[PDB]
């Protein structure tokens, strides 16, 4: 018997319900300070889910945790990062992603991708791709790039555990899933091509050997290993990973090299895959920007303090990223020269774009001085 439809229970229930509302405040978690005009559903469903006490900036609870680690490490604590703020709950993802819209959007991408592949194979459009680009550059080097995305994904494991608020945790996990999705989409592209071109080997053996032993990815692999396993400050991981390394090396490899060149060598397939990785990069950027610039670098009480650490980290990881790009440009020696694209002038402009965009998007925001021409020369030394 369901109380909603059973005539007798429904009657009993109707008798117990008062004929007036006992309060008029119907806005779920009405006390959350809205970032925009009115409270959004994203804020309502996400904010204050984390039960922080008052001794962790912004928390509404009190007292110590009920159970801590052996030795005394708190469930969540201030010792987890160098950065400080007056409120750890302040962050808002500009895209307002709670779980539902996040999977909804990715689901659209999942299903459309499969319709696109069935049609692409029926079209026979792989017929005009440059076979060298396909066999030597795409299969091997694009394949090896999946490990960088995968290392960035893995870097988020400790962040997911250690970060200090619910909005941050959501931003970090979605960022992680998008990174592993990028790695799986690269592998999906390689497996798809293997079905079309007899003899094309989609196994990861070669790409793995290239990521771990090829000088072209040596600096990238070293930096990713460091970001993932060499540190635990969760803010350092996110900043270094997305705002420095991925914003310079990753943007260069994905956009300036594999996507741009695919449209120089007649590759009509790859741009469908990088369209996704690049859309994920920009969505992730909006959130990372809110966390580091609006919330932390501009904290009214700790902004200068935080900029001190953000500037220190940037100097260190930018040097690593420049070294990684220095090694990576050695890949241009294996491709057909194309003026304005793979020649010295082409690479140089691709580098000005990457560093020039990075300066506006990140550096200028935290007060980090950077000489774009010097960074371009630093990398061109590897050309």
């Amino acid at each position: 018997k369901r109380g909603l439809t059973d005539p007798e229970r429904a009657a009993i229930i109707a008798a117990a319900v008062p004929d007036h509302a006992l309060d008029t405040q119907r806005k779920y978690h009405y006390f959350i300070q809205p970032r925009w005009k009115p409270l959004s559903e994203y804020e309502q469903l996400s904010c204050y889910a984390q039960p922080n006490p008052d001794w962790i900036a912004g928390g509404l609870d009190w007292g110590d945790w009920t159970q801590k680690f052996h030795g005394g490490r708190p469930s969540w604590g201030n010792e987890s990062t160098e950065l400080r703020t007056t409120d750890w709950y302040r962050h808002r993802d500009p895209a307002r992603r709670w779980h539902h819209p996040y999977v909804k959007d990715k689901s659209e991408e999942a299903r459309y991708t499969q319709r696109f592949l069935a049609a692409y194979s029926s079209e026979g459009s792989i017929r005009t791709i440059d076979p060298y680009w396909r066999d030597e550059i795409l299969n091997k080097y694009f394949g090896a790039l999946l490990y960088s995305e995968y290392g960035l994904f893995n870097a988020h494991s400790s962040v997911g555990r250690d970060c200090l608020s619910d909005t941050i945790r959501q931003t970090a996990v979605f960022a992680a899933l998008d990174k592993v999705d990028n790695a799986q989409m690269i592998q999906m592209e390689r497996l798809f091509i293997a079905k079309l071109v007899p003899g094309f080997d989609a196994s990861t053996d070669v790409p793995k050997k290239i990521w771990t032993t090829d000088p072209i990815y040596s600096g990238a692999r070293a930096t990713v290993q460091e970001i993932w396993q060499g540190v635990q400050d969760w803010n350092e991981i996110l900043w270094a990973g997305h705002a420095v390394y991925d914003a310079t090396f990753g943007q260069f490899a994905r956009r300036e090299f594999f996507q741009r060149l695919a449209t120089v060598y007649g590759d009509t397939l790859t741009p469908f895959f990088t369209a996704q990785s690049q859309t994920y990069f920009q969505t992730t950027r909006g959130a990372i920007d809110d966390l580091f610039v609006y919330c932390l670098a501009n904290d009214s009480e700790f902004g200068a303090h935080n900029r001190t650490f953000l500037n220190a980290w940037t100097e260190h990881y930018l040097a690593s990223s420049v070294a990684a790009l220095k090694d990576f440009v050695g890949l241009y020696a294996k491709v057909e020269k194309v003026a304005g694209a793979t020649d010295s002038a082409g690479v140089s402009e691709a580098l000005q774009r990457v560093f020039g965009d990075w300066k506006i998007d990140y550096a200028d925001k935290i007060g980090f001085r950077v000489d774009v021409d010097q960074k371009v020369d630093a990398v061109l030394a590897g050309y």
């Binding site: 006490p53 008052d54 001794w55 962790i56 900036a57 009190w62 007292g63 110590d64 680690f69 052996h70 030795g71 005394g72 490490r73 201030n78 010792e79 987890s80 990062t81 160098e82 400080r84 060499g230 540190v231 635990q232 400050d233 350092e236 700790f302 200068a304 303090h305 001190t308 650490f309 500037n311 220190a312």
Partner: protein, 167 residues
């Protein structure tokens, strides 16, 4: 006794006033270390400010951290404890101590005291967390060996509690 309100009270206010007087890294480091030794962990010297010590500790931490960024060269922020020691040296010294512990009782005091003395902002976070993890691993292995071997009556004696009532 009579407690004042949870979040805003005279105890928290009085301490915030003392903290505002801190002007140097070495003074604030001594302050935070004494504070942690006097008021934190089960071996603290005093439970008088039990309900406010965590918030006050956070405020000392904020002061020290700001003094660090304003007065210390950037390189120091990454590689040194505010006591002036090299962070890597502190890590090695404390792993060595716990590795020499012969009982869970000695191992536990070493892990607890490391935290009271070196918790950030005294030691850089990356070094502190990996040291704290190494110490925890050893403490658990010692403690979890034959966990149920000693009867409660014995454990009470070993711990040194004063049994006030047993139903």
């Amino acid at each position: 006794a009579k407690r004042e309100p949870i979040h805003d009270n005279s105890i928290r206010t009085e301490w915030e006033a003392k903290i505002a007087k801190l002007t140097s890294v070495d003074q604030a480091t001594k302050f935070i270390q004494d504070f942690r030794l006097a008021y934190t962990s089960p071996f603290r010297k005093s439970y008088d400010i039990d309900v406010d010590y965590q918030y006050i500790e956070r405020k000392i931490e904020e002061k020290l951290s700001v003094l660090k960024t304003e007065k210390l060269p950037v390189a120091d922020l990454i590689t040194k404890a505010t006591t002036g020691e090299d962070a890597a040296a502190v890590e090695a010294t404390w792993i060595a101590k716990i590795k020499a512990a012969k009982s869970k009782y000695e191992a536990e005091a070493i892990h607890i005291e490391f935290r009271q003395l070196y918790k950030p902002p005294v030691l850089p976070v990356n070094v502190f967390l990996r040291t704290d993890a190494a110490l925890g691993t050893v403490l658990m292995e010692i403690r979890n060996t034959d966990y149920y071997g000693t009867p409660l009556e014995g454990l009470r004696k070993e711990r040194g509690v004063k049994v006030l009532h047993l139903q």
